[PDB]
A paper describes a structure:
NagR, formerly termed YvoA, has been identified as a repressor protein from Bacillus subtilis that regulates genes involved in N-acetylglucosamine (GlcNAc) utilization. NagR acts as a negative transcriptional regulator, and binding of effector-free NagR to specific DNA operator sites blocks gene transcription. With more than 49000 deposited sequences, the GntR family of regulators (gluconate-operon repressor, Pfam family: PF00392) represents one of the largest groups of bacterial metabolite-responsive transcription factors. Their tertiary structure can be subdivided in almost all cases into two distinct domains: an N-terminal DNA-binding winged-helix-turn-helix (wHTH) domain and a C-terminal small-molecule effector-binding and oligomerization domain. In NagR and the entire GntR/HutC subfamily the C-terminal effector-binding domain adopts a so-called UTRA domain fold (Pfam family: PF07702) that is structurally homologous to the enzyme chorismate lyase.
To gain insight into DNA binding in the GntR/HutC subfamily of repressors, we determined the crystal structure of full-length NagR in complex with an idealized palindromic operator dre-site at 2.9 Å resolution. The asymmetric unit contains one NagR dimer in complex with a 19 bp fragment of dsDNA. Electron density is missing for several segments in the effector-binding domain as well for the peptide segment that interconnects the effector-binding domain and the DBD in each chain A and B of homodimeric NagR. In detail, helices αE3, αE4 and αE5 are not formed in chain A, while chain B lacks most parts of helix αE3 as well as the N-terminal ends of helices αE2 and αE5. Regarding the interdomain linker, residues 79 to 83 and residues 81 to 85 are missing in chain A and B, respectively. Apart from the striking absence of beta-strand β*, which occurs in the interdomain linker region of the GlcN-6-P and GlcNAc-6-P-bound state of NagR, DNA-bound NagR features a highly similar topology consisting of nine α-helices and nine β-strands. In the DNA-bound complex, the DBDs of NagR are pointing downward in direction of the very C-terminal strand βE7, which is in agreement with our previously proposed NagR DNA-binding model derived from YydK. Surprisingly, the orientation of the two-fold symmetry axis that relates the two effector-binding domains in NagR does not coincide with the two-fold axis that relates the two DBDs bound to the 19 bp palindromic DNA fragment since a crossing angle of 6.5° can be observed between the two local symmetry axes. Thus it appears that in the DNA-bound and ligand-free structure of NagR not only secondary structure elements in the effector-binding domain are considerably less well defined but that also the DBDs are more flexibly attached to the effector-binding domain than in GlcN-6-P- and GlcNAc-6-P-bound NagR.
Residue numbers in the entry:
A (entry chain B): 0 to 81, 85 to 112, 114 to 123, 125 to 160, 166 to 240
B (entry chain A): 0 to 79, 84 to 124, 126 to 152, 178 to 242
The structure:
Amino acid sequence: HMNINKQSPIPIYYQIMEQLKTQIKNGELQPDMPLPSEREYAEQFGISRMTVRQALSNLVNEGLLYRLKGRGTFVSKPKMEQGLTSFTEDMKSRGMTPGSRLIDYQLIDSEELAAILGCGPSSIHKITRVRLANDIPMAIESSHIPFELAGELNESIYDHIERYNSIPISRAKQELEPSAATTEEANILGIQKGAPVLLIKRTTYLQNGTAFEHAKSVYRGDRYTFVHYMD
Amino acid sequence: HMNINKQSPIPIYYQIMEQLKTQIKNGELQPDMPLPSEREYAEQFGISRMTVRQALSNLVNEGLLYRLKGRGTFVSKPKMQGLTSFTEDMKSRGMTPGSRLIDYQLIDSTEELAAILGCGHSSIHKITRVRLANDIPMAIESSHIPFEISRAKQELEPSAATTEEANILGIQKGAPVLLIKRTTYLQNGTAFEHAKSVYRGDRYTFVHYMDRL
DNA sequence: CAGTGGTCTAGACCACTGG
DNA sequence: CAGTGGTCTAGACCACTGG
């Protein structure tokens, strides 16, 4: 039971997206069942087929619908989410309360390797946090960021990056590698020395196709498994 | 320079997509230098604005270009992979993959295994290969299929080598290994292969790319 | 067959951007 | 200001599925 206002400042395709999205969650529409036609939709609202099509085409492009030559447009088979996740979002996803304990900060310059994150010789933020879940330490996170891409700040946080620049967030590159806990890794995380940890190098790009952050993290092997989902 | 076949059975946006893709890889077009206007493209080829826009839109959707309201459409710099087997994963690393079978079986279905995919307690293939890279042991892989493309689910977990694990791979016992459970589903929405692998920590790092908005 | 998505056209106004 | 992507319209032919 759908409603579209051509007069609204909110684009018509978006109105059609946002509402259908809920008609699916609410299961008012059922998977492996066709929707009204592109042409039928276009009439019911008194808009152009292509304007129907832009919303539908976006939803299919997001996996919520699918198409069959000569038959129609169909709703889909539900999904789960994790791409592009931070620790806080990774935890809320596992039903846990994310936490943060700052343990180190510095401003240091740069070897050639730090320059490899698309250096703009420059001054860098180096925040070393301890990541927690239900107040249990889960990981140690060393985050690397330039002043040529963030300047300075007093944080009290993802959006600052897209805010300080033209560009939004896009794609990310994670490198995982297994290790045994060093005595300081072990100490902080509260595990035995030599205990299995997971070393994650996450470098993150703008839609610029430019990276802003390179993060070396250490994750406890006992309480954390990396879950991933591709294609 | 760029060429459009309006009569051809391959659509015009796809023609535009494909060529542009190479002008970007080849660097004929430069990152952070804008493309010709949407309107400029439409004239230069003598086609409609919107069908140019379908090509670009698709490319921007693939991470290869980005748009700036009021300014234009710009290129992005980064490199390519995606969708992994052991063997494509190695070729990607400049290496020649190999396989040595060390076990094969058909066993009953236990419920935990059975919970993935359908019915169980039903005939399951269990192939255990030792995976090779330029003739080095890299992993020990126990792959599971019932005998009865799309999405994949990988779970990584770090560990220390058990003594037989160490044995095969030719590494010290207790050495850092990487435990990967790779479940892959068909377009059916039904699971196809469940693989429990063990990877040496010394010579292997897991690499992975993410998208979202 | 009448219906459907996939593609395509030749125009239109808007909000936004930079100089 | 003039240019750009963002949106929209009212038509069109096609190749394809089903009864």
